[PDB]
Design a protein around this ligand. Structure first.
Ligand code: ANP
Ligand code: ANP
Lengths: 391, 391
C-alpha cells in the first residue's frame, strides 16, 4: 500500500538489534551511564561467580587504548561445544541474546544475572572484545569485532588457573558525548561491591595515569554505612543493622541518621543496585514510616508535640543500605534499575517492622535523638507551611 | 557449586525469553502496570498507522472475559509471506522479537514503535491472541496460544476495508494480582491520545458494564492543556503554543499556569509518554527557567524584589504538554519511560527559548500575571525558608 509490503518488515538477527536499539539494552548511550554499564555488565557476572563461592579476586583495568578488562578467578565461561548450538558455549553466550547459565539455580543459586543478554550486549556494542577463559586446564582465547567472532574459540595454552577475562573497546558508533571511561565512576560501584562481598578482592587499575585501588573492605554493609557517613555527621551512635533470611528471601539492612536533610537509601538486589528503587524500597519506606510513627505514638512524642510525622520527615538525613537476596528477581528493564518482584516488598517490610521496632526499644538514646530529628522536621515542615500564608 | 558445563548454558528460543523474563519487556507483571501496557503496546501500533496518515478510527474494547481488542482502520499488518522467513509477514511480526517496519522510515516516517517487539511481546505473554487483518480485499485470521500459531494466517473472507484487530487474553501464568483491566487507566491514555492525534476517532467500549467513550478532540495539545486545567484555575487567558520542526525534530509545546502549586508536565515522543521524562523534559525545564528569569531581569522585576527565582518555583502551578516528534528515538527501557536522545534536549530548549521569549513579549498581561505568580512563589520560598530553618 504505502511501502507496507511484507518486505517492509525487517528482521534483525544476532546482535544487530542491540546495535540498532542499544537503549532498551544498555540504557543511556549518551550521558555516559550506559558506557559505564558496559564495564558493570561484565563485573556483575564476575561478582556472580563470587556469590557462588568461586571468584575471590576481580581486577578491572582501564587501558591506555580506551578499553577495560575484567578479570576474575571463577570457574570460567563454559568452553565446550554447545549440545544444541554447535559452537563453544563461550561463543554462544557472546553472540546470542537470552543465552546463559542463569535461567535456573543450577549454576548460580542467587545472582544479579538473569537475562542471558548482559555480556552479549557489551559484545554487540563493542568495536572489539577479547575473551580469555581459563578452565579445565586450558587457556582459551577469542577475539570479536562488533559481536562477530573472528575465529572459533581457541585453546591457546595450558593452565591450572580458572577464570574469565573480557576486554572490550566500546563502539563510538553507539556511545556519544561521554566516550572515555572515568575512574571514579568505576571506583564507586566497585567499592560498594567490595562492601557487599567481603572476601572478594577487587582491584581497580588505570593504565592511563597509573592510578589504582584495591577494595577489600571486610566490614560489610555496616562499614558501608559508616563510609557513606564519613564526610557527614551521624546523630546517633548505633547503626541499625539486621540480616534475615525468610521464605527464601534474604534482606540485609544497615542504616543511620545524620544531621543533614538529604535522604539516601542505596537499594540492591543480588548485588545489583536499583537507581529506581522498587519493591524493596517500597517495603522499606512503608515499614520505617509505620515503625517510626508507631514509636512516637506509643511513646507519646506525637502527643507531646502534636506532630504529624511523615515518611519524608523520617527519611531526612537517612543513610541506609538495603540489600536483598532474591532467588528469581524481576526487573522492569535490562539495566536492573527498579526491582519489580512483588513478594520482596513484604519480605523487607516484615523484617523492618519487627527488627526496627526492636532497635528503637533496645536503643533508647538513639531512638530519642532520631525521634527528635523527626519531630523537628515535622515542625520546620509545617512551620514553612504556615509561613506560606504568613508571607 | 561446580555446575558449569556447556549444557549449563540455556538458549531461550522464540518468545520463551519474554515469558521467562517478562519484566525487561513489559515491566511490572503484578501491579497492573505491565497488564495495561499490553494494551498500550497494541494501541501504539495503531497510533503509528494514524501518525502515518492511514488510520482514522481505533476502537479498543475491554471484553467481559477480561481480554482486550484493538481495532484500527489502517493499512493492516502485511500478510504477504516474508522473503526470508518463509511465513506470513503477520506471523513474523507476531512471533519474532526485533521484526517490524520501524527500523527505517519507509512505512512510517515517524512512529512511537521502533523496537520490533511490542506486539510480539504481547502475544508472547498472552495465553491466546486472535489476529484479524483486513488487507487488500481479503480478511485474514490467525490464532495463537502463548505465542504459537494454531494454524498459519488464513484468508477467511472478502473485504472492502483495511485494518488490524488484535484481541488478546493475557496469560495468568505471567500476570498476577492485578489481572482485570481498569477502564480509567485506558480512558486516560486514549483521551490524551485523542488530543495528540486530531482526526483519529478513539473509541473505548467496556463489555463488562456497557461503559463507553469516544474521544475525538481537535484542539490539539492546546485543548489538552485546557482539559488538564478545567479542574483547576488557569491564571491567564493565553496558553503558550508552538509547533516547529527544525533539524529534523518536531517539537510542540503548550503550557498554562493555574493558581495552584503543583507541576504537571506531560512529555511524549512520537505520542509515547515518558513517565521518567528525559531529554525533552531537560530542555524544557532549562529553557523555561532561563526565559522567565531573563524576562524578570530585563523587565526589572528582580531589581525590585531581590530574589533568584529558581525553576522549581517557576514551575509551580504549571501545566504543560511537550510533544516531540523524532525520527530515530532512543529510550533506556523497552517500555519507553525516558527519552535519552540528546539531540532532542537542544531542540526543545532552543525552540522554547525563542518562542517563550517572544510569548512574554507578545503577551504582556499574561507575562506580568505569571511573573506575579513566580514572584510570590520565590518570595514564599524564602518566607517558608525562614521558618523552616528557624525551628
Ligand atoms: N565471568 C564469568 N564467569 C563465568 N561465567 C560467565 C561469566 N560471564 C558470563 N558467564 C556465563 O555466561 C552467561 C551469559 O552471560 P550474560 O550474557 O551476560 O547473561 P546473564 O548471566 O544471564 N545476566 P544479565 O546481565 O541479566 O543478562 C551467564 O549465564 C554465565 O553462566
Ligand atoms: N495495527 C497495525 N497496523 C499496521 N501494521 C501493524 C500493526 N501492528 C503492527 N504492525 C507492523 O508490524 C510491526 C511490528 O510491531 P511490533 O512487534 O509491535 O514492533 P514495533 O512497531 O517495531 N514497535 P515497539 O513496541 O517499539 O517494539 C510494526 O513494525 C508495523 O509495521
Amino acid at each position: 500500500s504505502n511501502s507496507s509490503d511484507s518486505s517492509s518488515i525487517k528482521v534483525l538477527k544476532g546482535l544487530d538489534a542491540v546495535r540498532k536499539r542499544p537503549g532498551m539494552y544498555i540504557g543511556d548511550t549518551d550521558d555516559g551511564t550506559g558506557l559505564h554499564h558496559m564495564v558493570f555488565e561484565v563485573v556483575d557476572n564476575a561478582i556472580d561467580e563470587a556469590l557462588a563461592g568461586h571468584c575471590k579476586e576481580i581486577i578491572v583495568t582501564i587501558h591506555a587504548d580506551n578499553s577495560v578488562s575484567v578479570q576474575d578467578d571463577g570457574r570460567g565461561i563454559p568452553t565446550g561445544i554447545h549440545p544444541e548450538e554447535g559452537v563453544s558455549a563461550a561463543e554462544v553466550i557472546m553472540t546470542v541474546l537470552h543465552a546463559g547459565g542463569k535461567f535456573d539455580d543450577n549454576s548460580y543459586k542467587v545472582s544479579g544475572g538473569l537475562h542471558g543478554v548482559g555480556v552479549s550486549v557489551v559484545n554487540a556494542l563493542s568495536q572489539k572484545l577479547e575473551l580469555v577463559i581459563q578452565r579445565e586446564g586450558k587457556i582459551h582465547r577469542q577475539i570479536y569485532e562488533h559481536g562477530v567472532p573472528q575465529a572459533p574459540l581457541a585453546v591457546t595454552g595450558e593452565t591450572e588457573k580458572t577464570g574469565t577475562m573480557v576486554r572490550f573497546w566500546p563502539s563510538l558508533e553507539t556511545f556519544t558525548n561521554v566516550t572515555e571511561f572515568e575512574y571514579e565512576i568505576l571506583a564507586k560501584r566497585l567499592r560498594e561491591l567490595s562492601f557487599l562481598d567481603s572476601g572478594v578482592s577487587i582491584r581497580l587499575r588505570d593504565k592511563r595515569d597509573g592510578k589504582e585501588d584495591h577494595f577489600h573492605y571486610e566490614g560489610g554493609i555496616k562499614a558501608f554505612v559508616e563510609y557513606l557517613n564519613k564526610n557527614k555527621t551521624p546523630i546517633h551512635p548505633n547503626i541499625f543493622y539486621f540480616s534475615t533470611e525468610k521464605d527464601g528471601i534474604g534482606v540485609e539492612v544497615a542504616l543511620q541518621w545524620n544531621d543533614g536533610f538529604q535522604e539516601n537509601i542505596y537499594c540492591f538486589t543480588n548485588n545489583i543496585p536499583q537507581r529506581d528503587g522498587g519493591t524493596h524500597l517500597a517495603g522499606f519506606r512503608a515499614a520505617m514510616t509505620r515503625t517510626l510513627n508507631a514509636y512516637m505514638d506509643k511513646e507519646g512524642y506525637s502527643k507531646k508535640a502534636k506532630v504529624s510525622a511523615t515518611g519524608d520527615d523520617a527519611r531526612e538525613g537517612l543513610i541506609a543500605v538495603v540489600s536483598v537476596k532474591v532467588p528469581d528477581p524481576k526487573f522492569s528493564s535490562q539495566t536492573k534499575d527498579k526491582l519489580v518482584s512483588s513478594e520482596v516488598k513484604s519480605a523487607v517490610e516484615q523484617q523492618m517492622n519487627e527488627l526496627l521496632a526492636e532497635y528503637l526499644l533496645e536503643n533508647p538514646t538513639d531512638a530519642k535523638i532520631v525521634v527528635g530529628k523527626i519531630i523537628d522536621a515535622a515542625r520546620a515542615r509545617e512551620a514553612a507551611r504556615r509561613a506560606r500564608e504568613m508571607t
